[PDB]
Amino acid sequence: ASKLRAVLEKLKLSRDDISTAAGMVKGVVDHLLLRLKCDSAFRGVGLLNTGSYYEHVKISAPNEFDVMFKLEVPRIQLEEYSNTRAYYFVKFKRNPKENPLSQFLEGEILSASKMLSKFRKIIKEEINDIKDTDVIMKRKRGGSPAVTLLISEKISVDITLALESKSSWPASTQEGLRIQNWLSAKVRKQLRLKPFYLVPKHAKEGNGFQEETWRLSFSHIEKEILNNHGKSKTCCENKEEKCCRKDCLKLMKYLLEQLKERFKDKKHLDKFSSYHVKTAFFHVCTQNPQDSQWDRKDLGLCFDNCVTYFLQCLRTEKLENYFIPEFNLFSSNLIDKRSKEFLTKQIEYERNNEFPVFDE
């Protein structure tokens, strides 16, 4: 309770850090957008800010930003890849007008690897010409859909090409976004009338990938739900309606980062990400729909509700994608049994002992 409040104070971002960091990102992102808008393929490219900074749940330091460079793609037709629910081939319908994206077609299929390789090539050419800002491209590992840049040896930015489709959401999402009892059926209907996005992350095929495939993304809806998160339309707009939803997500994020640090010696928790705690947090919001279940004075119990549900996901080896229910973030194809059992034991110990990982 009071220990958690002190943790949240420590996690607060400094306004001086926010300002200098955003300015460095803006300088790079703006320069990259200008160049890309000169290419015919990436002509109508547009900025879409996503991830924890723009959801206001980034913790500790503003040193990681996520942006999508969305491309409006009309007349788009999807073909699910091998029942994976999240990965798709992209096609166009009947060539009614000739395409800007025709150079990336492998037959009738729009190749994600071709589009991403050219996107990456342009950004690489551009970063070694920026206004005396030190910018370096990093390719981690894990098949990220992003081009990752390090600015001033300090600030990471993920730049993700994303196709924008204004069509109805794919059938695999029909039972997802279960917000009806929390944010209302009205809101769910309005949200599902919004575009969805496809990012160039490929389905796995042995040692390699299906290099034409794309993956569904609802990162923009995640931001909208986090920034408009109450049952009451005035949640967090006045002194009588201060909930602790965002504080709970922040604490979950910090719990995971701290444990990943304490297990750096064998990198046992390497496969776990903040997106796992984010997804579990959205499910707890569905389970606890009332703002009164997130009262600021109940921070300790609400965080406990969050921790217990995440443990249950670990122990049952099931964490459903909030938008695609049959996509299991915790399947053995993605995270091994040993890793999940390991994190369960640690979170179990931390909970039973009032989170010593949070002591100063």
Ligand SMILES: Nc1ncnc2c1ncn2[C@@H]1O[C@H](COP(=O)(O)OP(=O)(O)OP(=O)(O)O)[C@@H](O)[C@H]1O
């Ligand atoms: N496994 C995934 N499935 C679907 N979307 C993902 C996945 N991993 C990341 N994302 C999307 O990418 C965005 C940026 O991811 P990132 O790893 O930067 O985490 P984040 O939410 O920004 O939190 P933080 O950066 O503070 O760890 C996420 O908000 C999420 O929308």
Ligand SMILES: Nc1ccc(-c2cc(Cl)c(Cl)c3[nH]c4c(c23)CN(C(=O)CO)CC4)cn1
């Ligand atoms: N700006 C954005 C937003 C959404 C996505 C993204 C989308 C989908 Cl669908 C999946 Cl499966 C994704 N996996 C990862 C990302 C991602 C992005 N990513 C990181 O941000 C690491 O910090 C790597 C891991 C990408 N960039």
Ligand SMILES: [Mg+2]
């Ligand atoms: Mg991020």
Ligand SMILES: [Mg+2]
């Ligand atoms: Mg990121």
Ligand SMILES: [Zn+2]
């Ligand atoms: Zn609120």
